[PDB]
Design a protein around this ligand. Structure first.
Ligand code: L10
Length: 351
């Protein structure tokens, strides 16, 4: 019942995987793990396999490993990453130190797509429809992505899209500093730590992404946090008293009040020649007050997606128990929890 495993060294890390996975080649790495492409001989799919790096080295890491496996097991949606397989070479809990996560290899990310091919309005409609369809599902489980950006959106050759989170980097202060894509899609309340954030932080990200699909250019390519804020406030206007009250960070509030007040721009004069319905949706997504942003479910009913919208085929998630998030456990308790989840994994059917 347990498959046979074989070992190999790729870019100075050991991969020990079931025999079903062949032709492993490295695709990326970071602080939390490494990814390889492979051929799954069982299903006949090209796959991507993330090996987590020392998943139980700290409490923070062990809880993260549990969190990821729990999230990935729950996800059952066409526009979101699905777990094809999870495995470990360990034969018991006592020797359980390694976690490997398998999903479909899609072919490209959305950075590839915006860089290398011109998109018509129909392409923008279809790609953004799918992001929002997946986001509806994600948000219905009270899950916030928080790092929606083109490199976390995988796209096949028929422009079918999946939301994922490679999750290889730490998102430290340094990784978020300077002229960097890691910060250009973040809602300003997350970027500047204004307040406790909502799931519409992800709608801001969709707005930034949609703008970029329409123009071919980054919406807010700030050279740093403050420059990026300035670019944002030039477009959407400076906040009024109502939003200022909601900024619970007194330090952040003090700084924004130092800026000269600016009105919202005419978005038809920014997104020159775009579908007026695209421009209308953008204005509803790129609202500074996150209480007043359009939701994913609201946005799916917008006239821009009239050719794709089907309210009978935009499903929500099964209930997701996140009570673990408020729980303090030891490493070995997170480990055993994670081990139970690996052991109980049942793969999806191959249609
Ligand atoms: C889209 C959603 C929000 C459900 C999410 C997905 C996710 N993980 C992944 O996408 N995992 C992944 C990505 C690529 C590969 Cl090859 C294998 C696994 N999250 C993740 C990543 C790291 C830590 C915790 C959660 N969060």
């Amino acid at each position: 019942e347990r498959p046979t495993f074989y070992r190999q060294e790729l870019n100075k890390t050991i991969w020990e995987v079931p025999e079903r996975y062949q032709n492993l080649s490295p695709v990326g790495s970071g602080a939390y793990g490494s990814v390889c492409a492979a051929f799954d001989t069982k299903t006949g799919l090209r796959v991507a396999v993330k090996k987590l790096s020392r998943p139980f080295q700290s409490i923070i890491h062990a809880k993260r490993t549990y969190r990821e496996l729990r999230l990935l097991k729950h996800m059952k949606h066409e526009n979101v990453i699905g777990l094809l397989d999870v495995f470990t070479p360990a034969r018991s809990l006592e020797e359980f130190n390694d976690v490997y996560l398998v999903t479909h290899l899609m072919g490209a990310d959305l950075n590839n797509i915006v860089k290398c091919q011109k998109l018509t309005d129909d392409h923008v409609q279809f790609l953004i429809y799918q992001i929002l369809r997946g986001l509806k599902y994600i948000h219905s489980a009270d899950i916030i992505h928080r790092d929606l950006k083109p490199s976390n959106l995988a796209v096949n050759e028929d422009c079918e899209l999946k939301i994922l989170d490679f999750g290889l980097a730490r998102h430290t202060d340094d990784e978020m500093t300077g002229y960097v894509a890691t910060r250009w899609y973040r809602a300003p309340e997350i970027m500047l730590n204004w307040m406790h954030y909502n799931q519409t932080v992800d709608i801001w990200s969709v707005g930034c992404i949609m703008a970029e699909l329409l123009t071919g250019r980054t919406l807010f390519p700030g050279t740093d946090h403050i420059d990026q804020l300035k670019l944002i406030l030039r477009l959407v206007g400076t906040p009024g008293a109502e939003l200022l009250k909601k900024i619970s960070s007194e330090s952040a509030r003090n700084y924004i009040q130092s800026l000269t007040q600016m009105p919202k721009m005419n978005f038809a004069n920014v997104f020159i020649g775009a579908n007026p319905l695209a421009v209308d949706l953008l204005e509803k997504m790129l609202v500074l007050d996150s209480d007043k942003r359009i939701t994913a479910a609201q946005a799916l009913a917008h006239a821009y997606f009239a050719q794709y919208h089907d309210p009978d085929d935009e499903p929500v998630a099964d209930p997701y128990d996140q009570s673990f998030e408020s729980r303090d456990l030891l490493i070995d308790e997170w480990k055993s929890l994670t081990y139970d989840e690996v052991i109980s994994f049942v793969p999806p059917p191959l249609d």
